[PDB]
Design a protein around this nucleic acid. Sequence first.
DNA 1: TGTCGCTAAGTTC
DNA 2: GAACTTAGC
Length: 868
Amino acid sequence: QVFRFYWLDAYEDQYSQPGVVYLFGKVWIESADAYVSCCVSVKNIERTVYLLPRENRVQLSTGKDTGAPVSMMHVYQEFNEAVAEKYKIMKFKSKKVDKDYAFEIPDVPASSEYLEVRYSADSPQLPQDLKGETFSHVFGTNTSSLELFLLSRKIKGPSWLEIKSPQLSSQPMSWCKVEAVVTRPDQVSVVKDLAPPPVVVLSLSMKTVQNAKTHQNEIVAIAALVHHTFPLDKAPPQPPFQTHFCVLSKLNDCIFPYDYNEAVKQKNANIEIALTERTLLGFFLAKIHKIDPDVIVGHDIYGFDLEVLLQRINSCKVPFWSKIGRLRRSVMPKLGGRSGFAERNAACGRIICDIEISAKELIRCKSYHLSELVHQILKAERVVIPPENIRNAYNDSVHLLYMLENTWIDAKFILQIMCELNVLPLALQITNIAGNVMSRTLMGGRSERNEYLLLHAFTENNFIVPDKPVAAYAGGLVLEPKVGFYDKFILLLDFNSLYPSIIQEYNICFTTVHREADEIPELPHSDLEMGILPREIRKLVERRRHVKQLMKQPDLNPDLYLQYDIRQKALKLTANSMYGCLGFSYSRFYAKPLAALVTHQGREILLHTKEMVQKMNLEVIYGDTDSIMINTNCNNLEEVFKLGNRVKSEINKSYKLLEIDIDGIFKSLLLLKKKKYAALTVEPTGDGKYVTKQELKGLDIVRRDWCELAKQAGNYVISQILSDQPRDSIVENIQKKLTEIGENVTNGTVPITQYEINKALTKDPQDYPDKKSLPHVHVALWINSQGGRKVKAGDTISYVICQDGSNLSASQRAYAQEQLQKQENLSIDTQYYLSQQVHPVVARICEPIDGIDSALIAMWLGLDPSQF
DNA sequence: TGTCGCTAAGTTC
DNA sequence: GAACTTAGC
Ligand SMILES: Nc1nc2c(ncn2[C@H]2C[C@H](O)[C@@H](COP(=O)(O)OP(=O)(O)OP(=O)(O)O)O2)c(=O)[nH]1
Ligand SMILES: [Mg+2]
């Protein structure tokens, strides 16, 4: 009778069906010897509300306190007579529950005997401010059904659940192959120590042509690659994809080149030719249903792909839209809106993976378009079909098949990108650590995960969580740096996860810090037992430490090393975000005083570490909120390491948990300003041998707002300034290279691609206030003006400053590379590139190096030294 | 409908 | 002296 299934996604509707939460997942079947999708609809998820008894009777807040004691019986009478009749509440169940409270609300006793009252969801809902003559507050009024079913039953992320006495549904309700009905939340439990099962992953790529007359989008080709056993606890499978399906729709106006039949016949029989977008979308929905994917993945799928598909279904009215999800409905969710919540609910029960958001979360790249990601991760070359060609692609069957194959190659690229970053296993692991639903975790953002993590930590520990909600404080300290160049060995010491360590050491928790509703609250007493937040932060720190130690294992494959690095970075970001959510003003657990205390202790620890290092009779040169750089004044490497170990031990002697480590050793240092330096890191190899690797932190060469010309010039200049050659030869080499680049630029030898300057928008092009035409925004608008895929917010736009005789300010002349390559009346701005893009970079780089000053650089570059 | 924190150099108007 | 952006912790 028991029914055991592994759950992935949960969907709820707080209005359509009240007190009903759906759990989608996989279940084992011996007949097919396979896992099949199923949906269990936990019904009768009774709403719960906790009423806080008062200390003494109050005459409806009019006569103030009267001194009459109030007990649980009086509270029950009051709720049964007045509140129940007033709010049209028929049946309710009451009990006394002793719970503790520590959150941002006044006059709520720390540990009190609340009266819990449960009533059916369908009945009306109490109001948040409801106050009677016997109680002063009601908690949990608006707690969503899904949240109650998750926290109460202790489910934390995808896992195996056991159901007692399942009931077959009277009529079909979901599109899955197995349906169960749970009549109460108490019949569902979680089973531990089992292997996660394989899932079905479908990567989709759609090529669309924008309608000329109607100024809208009409899909023309859709390809997808599906794997039926994509694991979630082992390495990605090779080959990544098992099978695929392609569909192509002839344009409403254009016609096939009298050879489409023969071309398709000689190519393959796995491609579906659709006469319209209606048939194409129907075929896509049928294939999705038959495959029943569990993770649909793509690029900008939340933003532009799923929304386009749903809108096209609505416009052409393709029947049975609900198949694009898992549930059965008739009223599509309203489109538009901010983010992709509407698009997410439009395919409920099917996790959605936008590789763009995952890549943003994990890796850092200059641009996030598909081409840049492909060139940066898989190290390939991605062919981009011009938007004009696609409309003209349906003129030769060869080019039609080429377009279809390009879509297929994009799909394969997306799947490989997903595999390499280990998006799915990492997402599942983070979801299990936090406790939220996987579909939300894969959508980015850290506030949700931290909120759910603390929610679990406090629910399992007998606390009452706060109701969902309907420069600020002193932060890090950066030491004043002694700018300049250093040739001896500079030792960089750093602290290990300084903020989580501070939280652990000083018991900075929710249940210990006696706040008072912008001062810094006093530190908690040591004798107090560990709180709720420190325990979770320590668990996360321990997981990160274990991953690091595993990385320390010698003879590890480079790819596995990259995977471990990504996982460790994700865990560090999760700990940092757990700290940060204490400062978010729009957070369930906003605790600004706690974040202020954490930052204040960090500043204190940094200042004390600096004091100790200085008292040790050495020289300090820099530090950013947890790190310190020391001037060794030595040359032998062994002495450097011995001094580092000595100082590390001396510093660590004063902290119970905090750890200081040798962040690095530098052979040559170039410290320009705060948060800007370059150095030659020294990695030992054995027998006293030490290899060198050039590391730049903060320079203008490592930012996407400078031309590649300036990037290469600064790279060479820094390479010289850091080497061991004598100063005179370094200066002469710099002069020769600068003259060479000047001659090349003046003669136009430099290629076009080295001129682009990239900037990322924050809002949409229109929403930007018309404050002049700040280059990127200007160029952005042009891209939107032309008939191509739009450039929405959070997109990298590349522009090149050119000349057209406009005689305007240099900023206003920003243009697009395609425009310049197309227009015959525009040309590159040589003086701009050699004056405001290269010279400032080299001048900042060579500021403390004797022998070079701004005038000399300007002269050597070929610029006129008049205005310099 | 949610969108981790603060700090700081650098460009533009 | 304010905005905007992109690095750094
Ligand atoms: N809220 C928030 N705080 C951060 C973030 N990044 C860094 N911090 C803060 C908290 C960290 O404890 C502190 C120092 O960070 P580090 O870069 O030195 O990393 P960490 O010390 O955790 O590890 P490490 O041993 O130095 O490699 O800066 C972040 O992304 N968000
Ligand atoms: Mg650190």
